[PDB]
Structures are given as C-alpha cells and as structure tokens.
Amino acid sequence: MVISINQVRQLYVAKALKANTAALTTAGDIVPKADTAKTTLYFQSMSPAGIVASDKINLKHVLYAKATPSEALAHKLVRYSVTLDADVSATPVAGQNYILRLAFRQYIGLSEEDQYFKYGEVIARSGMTASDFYKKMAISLAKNLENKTESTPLVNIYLISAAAASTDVPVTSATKESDLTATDYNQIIIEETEQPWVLGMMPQAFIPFTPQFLTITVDGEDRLWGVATVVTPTKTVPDGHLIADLEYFCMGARGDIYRGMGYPNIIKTTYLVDPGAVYDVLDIHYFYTGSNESVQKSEKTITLVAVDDGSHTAMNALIGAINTASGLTIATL
C-alpha cells in the first residue's frame, strides 16, 4: 500500500538484539548503536546481504519517539443487533413481507458513491414465533450474503439464543432449518468480514454497511419494521497485513523504487516480515538542521518494528536497549 510520509519514512525489522556489530549473524538483526557522548543514534541492522546502518539521528533533533502496542492497530469488525421493534408489533404480523436492506458503501471502489445493496426476505405467517422468525431470516440473510458464488466476502451473519446469549452460532448458505434447533432466538448479528489481502498491490480495506428495514403495514400505518443498534465489536483483524504492507513501501526508500516492472529484469528484494504474526511499531521522528542563515528542518522518521508475543517482550527489549545507549525517554509500553 501507499502511505503518507513526512518527507521520508524508512523501516527496520527488529528480529534480534545482539548488543554489538560483531554478533550480527542472521538476517534482520538489530543493535542500537551510539557513542559515549550521546549525540548520534543509529541502527546497525543486518540485512540479508550485509550490514547496513540508518541515517544518523542527532539526539538534540528528535521530535517524538513513541512506541505503539499491537492492540492499537487492530480494526474492530463492527456488528449490528437486528431485532423486532416491539413498538410496532412484538410478533411478526401474519400477512406482511418482512424485508431488510443492507446498504454497502465501499463496494469494489473506494468512494462512498460506489454502493451495493443486498436484501433478506421472510414472509411472516400465522403462529410464527419470533424465534421461528430469526431462524427463517438469518438463513435468508445468509443465502444472499454468505453465498459461495459472490465476488467478495461481504458480511458474517450469526444468531444469538436467549439461553446462552454470548456465543454466536454461524448461519451460512448450507445451514438448514433442522441444524438451528433452538426456540429462543432473539437477534440477528451482522458482522463485517476481512476482505482479501495481497502484498503491496491490494491494501487492507473494508466494506462498511448499514442494515435498513422496509415498511410493513400495521392497522393501516406503514410503520418501519425493525431497529439496528451498533453493539460493541468482538472480532478484530490482526496487525499482520498492515506491517507486511509497511515493509513493502519503506523498502523502496532504502533500495529500488520499482518492484516488479519488467519481469525478466528486477532486483528481487527479500522481505523479513511474516504476514501471519502481530507486530509492534516504534517511530523515531527527527530532522536535520544546519549552521547558517539557511538552517531549518528536513523532517524524517525511522520506523522500527519488533514482533509481538502477547506481553510485548521483543519490543520492550528494543526500547530498553535504545534507552541506555541513547538516553531517550521512550515509554516502555
């Protein structure tokens, strides 16, 4: 993906801490190097084809040096609690068509003018309980949205019973009426889905929606049918696909600017980030001033990325190594 930069951004992956340049053995190692007079900070990093350093950070010219946890870069897949509005009728009115419209907004193109509209439908009948209704509409909402033949995954749709009320039973295009055997269904949960991701060419982007109801007559009045309230999300996508795209962009600042343009003829850069793991980010943002009447700042930033194992041990060892060599107050997260 393409990001915005403050005039440059270069990324190093902190796979190891070796404390000196003579112990750099495998690819992706990191030492934070500085001298006794704490005026320059740089990172002798072991690339897959030798040892390489960074631009030399003047420690009087840092602006912010903030390290972020891996929980702060997870997109929370939003949910909606679709229920029966009890003000119109607590029971499904036995003759009406009960239709619900999903209004998607990023479709196959980014603007909110590229839209997509999908529907679920249940004819309500006499004696049909509300639990027999949500058993009948989550199937009809799954047959249109959780289908096998759609172009892109749109939503994930569950049912919530009144007994458990915390676990979600998934409803798909293959689930029948006999598989969902429960008589206390009270809502339909419509959750976002993670879209497909390709390294460098297809960024991590999502499709939002809004469950909108249609009008069903009660005593002559065409009253809107239901209510949809944004309940708190319980599923998040990891940081694996943002940092995997972040090494793909920032390697073109230190290296070749094009990536595959003409393929008998490219410089194959080997990347170090596994896209299947979560990662922490540390951004040392600084500048370069001179000594003249033309002095002021050419602003820069250096991103260091270490692997996150649950309690951020591989990142905090890097912060604990930068704090002693350079003497900065980077907050150990």
Binding site: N316, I319, G320, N323, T324, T329, I330, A331, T332
Partner: protein, 174 residues
C-alpha cells in the same frame, strides 16, 4: 520500620528500594504492606496521593520472615519518567499491630524517603570547579547551587516537601 538503601542506580536505569522492619523484639507481629511511588507532580501531604506512579503489594511476590525484608529494582524507563529530572517519594506501610509495651511515638505504620539523581549535581560541581581552575575565582552560581541544595536538604529533613519541590522545580530543572 526503616530503609536499608534507597538509591538510584549509578547506571541511571534502576531505582533501588530495599526496605526492612526494625529488629527490636516488639515488631515481631509487624510486617511490610506496600510500596507507593510518587513524584513531584502527584505528591500530597496526607499520605500517598490518588493515581500514583507505581503501587506494589508484597504478598504478590512471596508464597513470614521473608515478608519482613523486601528489595525492589524498578526500571525507571518503564515508569515513563525522566531519571534525571524526577524526585521520587517512596512510601511504605506495615499492616501490623505492635505489642502493648511499645514506647510512645515509635508505633508509626508509614515512613517516607525522597530520591533524586546526583549525577547532574556532580556534573554541575565539576563544571564549576573547571571554571574555578581558570583564574581561581569562585563563580557565584556555584555558591548559589550549594546553598539551594542545602535549602532542599533542610526542607526534606523538616518535612516541608511543598517548598522543597518549589525550589527543585524553580532551580534544578528549569
């Protein structure tokens, strides 16, 4: 109850706290309770403040004489404070009743110990001595620093921590 050593590490990376309960016979029932760390920003006269910098409860470490002595080494960078421009206040508590034979005034659950970094003061003294080497004249900033340090000493030993912080912030930070 007293302090064994209350010092900031010479590497300017750890804050050493080593507390102990007094050896006299009638603190047998008394133990160590907790360690609360406050800075010049969050201090209050009436004991530790709310939203403190770092709270420590000592049953958590152990699984009874081991509980009478405790030693901590806090990575200062993990506390998200500057080791050079921070004045730490270290409270300790007892959670224990002494015997009925205690002489009066000795039964006090809480104590306090102030901490600062002596490296910047050492560097200032070295700089002023370097100035003195040239022409053998005493800079007045050196005498001002000496007397202001003595003022903070008097404030600490008299317990007047508010004016102590006022002097610290006004002179040894800004």
């Amino acid at each position: 109850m007293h302090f064994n050593e209350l010092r900031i590490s010479q590497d300017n990376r750890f804050l050493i706290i080593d507390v102990s309960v007094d050896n006299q016979d009638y603190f047998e029932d008394v133990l160590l309770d907790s360690i609360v760390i406050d800075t010049q920003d969050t201090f209050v006269m009436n004991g530790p403040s709310d939203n403190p910098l770092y709270i420590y409860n000592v049953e958590d470490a152990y699984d009874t004489q081991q509980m009478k002595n405790v030693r901590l080494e806090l990575n200062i960078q993990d506390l998200k404070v500057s080791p050079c421009s921070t004045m730490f206040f270290v409270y300790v508590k007892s959670k224990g009743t002494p015997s009925t034979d205690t002489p009066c005034g000795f039964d006090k659950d809480q104590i306090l110990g102030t901490v600062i970094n002596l490296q910047p003061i050492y560097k200032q003294t070295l700089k002023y001595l370097k100035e003195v080497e040239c022409d053998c004249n005493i800079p007045k900033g050196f005498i001002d620093m000496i007397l202001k340090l003595k003022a903070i000493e008097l404030c600490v030993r008299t317990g007047n921590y508010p004016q102590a912080i006022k002097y610290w912030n006004k002179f040894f930070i800004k």
